[PDB]
Design a protein around this ligand. Structure first.
Ligand code: BEF
Ligand SMILES: [Mg+2]
Ligand code: NA
Lengths: 133, 166
């Protein structure tokens, strides 16, 4: 607890890599969603408790509900005011523009490297405290 | 884009390995998971090519394997996956011949004791029943045959690194 992050990602290999990277950054409270509907549902449940996820990392292509539609639902239907950052195998400027215009705050392309994750967390992640040689 | 010359981007894979801490079960475990995922995904793509011929599903499968191969530094596999995605989206209109792509290898001699066409499968597609979508399907089949070769090459390099058949 303290920092709480949602990783939305249909590929289990990618889930496991970002989870380990976040753990190494001292963040242990990581939840996983496999598609955009599950993401909506989880943010929706936490919405009741009266707390945000500090951050959501959102994949774009996923079955059932993709990350663009997921973001739209989370923004529009739920309160949601905290950061959502695309984390995706995309790509080019069309994809980045689309993600930002859908209500995502930022954009990371896979592979995500540890130093770049550090920068995103410092930028966007509320209670995050980072080290350090 | 030009396909990367190196089968493994060691900058990325070394970073994955650096997260092991203690025995190597994390990184080797991801390699093993990826290998399985690749076999499942190739079978799925082949099933589409032979059956429903759904370009959107082929694009989703390409994009799926792209993310995992890229995260493990298997950058030639990731590149061919990206081509499949774009072909499935009708956003590309060619795919290079296997000879051109094997000639870009940095360790160009890695292609010496294996049959580069061994894992090739032919697309069951009439001509006969040909239409505006036929090229994309046939170029994705071409790309998948390349992908199976790139997968075998990555397995060779990985098996050599691990000193064990993966
Ligand atoms: F499927 Be995600 F966009 F990498
Ligand atoms: Mg995905
Ligand atoms: Na958030």
């Amino acid at each position: 607890t303290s920092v709480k992050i949602l990783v939305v990602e249909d590929n289990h290999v990618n889930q496991e890599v970002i989870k380990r990277m976040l753990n190494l950054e001292g963040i242990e409270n990581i939840e996983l969603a496999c598609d955009g509907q599950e993401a909506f549902d989880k943010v929706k449940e936490l919405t009741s408790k009266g707390e945000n996820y500090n951050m959501i990392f959102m994949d774009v292509q996923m079955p059932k509900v993709d990350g663009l539609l997921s973001t739209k639902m989370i923004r529009r239907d739920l309160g949601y005011t905290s950061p959502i950052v695309a984390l995706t195998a995309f790509a080019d400027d069309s994809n980045i523009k689309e993600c930002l215009e859908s209500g995502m705050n930022g954009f990371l392309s896979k592979p995500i490297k540890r130093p770049k994750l550090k920068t995103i967390l410092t930028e966007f992640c509320a209670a995050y405290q980072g080290k350090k040689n | 884009s030009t396909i990367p010359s190196e089968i493994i981007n060691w900058t990325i894979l070394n970073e994955i390995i650096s997260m092991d801490d203690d025995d190597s079960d994390f990184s080797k475990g991801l390699i093993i998971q990826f290998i399985d995922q690749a076999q499942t995904t190739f079978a799925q793509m082949q099933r589409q090519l032979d059956g429903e011929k759904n370009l959107t599903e082929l694009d989703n499968l390409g994009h799926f394997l792209k993310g995992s191969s890229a995260a493990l530094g298997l950058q030639r596999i990731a590149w061919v996956c990206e081509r499949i995605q774009n072909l499935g989206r009708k956003m590309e209109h060619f795919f290079p011949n296997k000879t051109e792509l094997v000639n870009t290898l940095s360790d160009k001699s890695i292609i010496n004791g294996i049959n580069i066409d061994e894992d090739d499968e032919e697309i069951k597609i009439q001509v006969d029943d040909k239409d505006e979508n036929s090229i994309y399907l046939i170029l994705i089949a071409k790309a998948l045959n390349q992908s199976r070769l790139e997968f075998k090459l990555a397995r060779i390099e990985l098996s050599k690194y691990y000193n064990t058949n993966l």
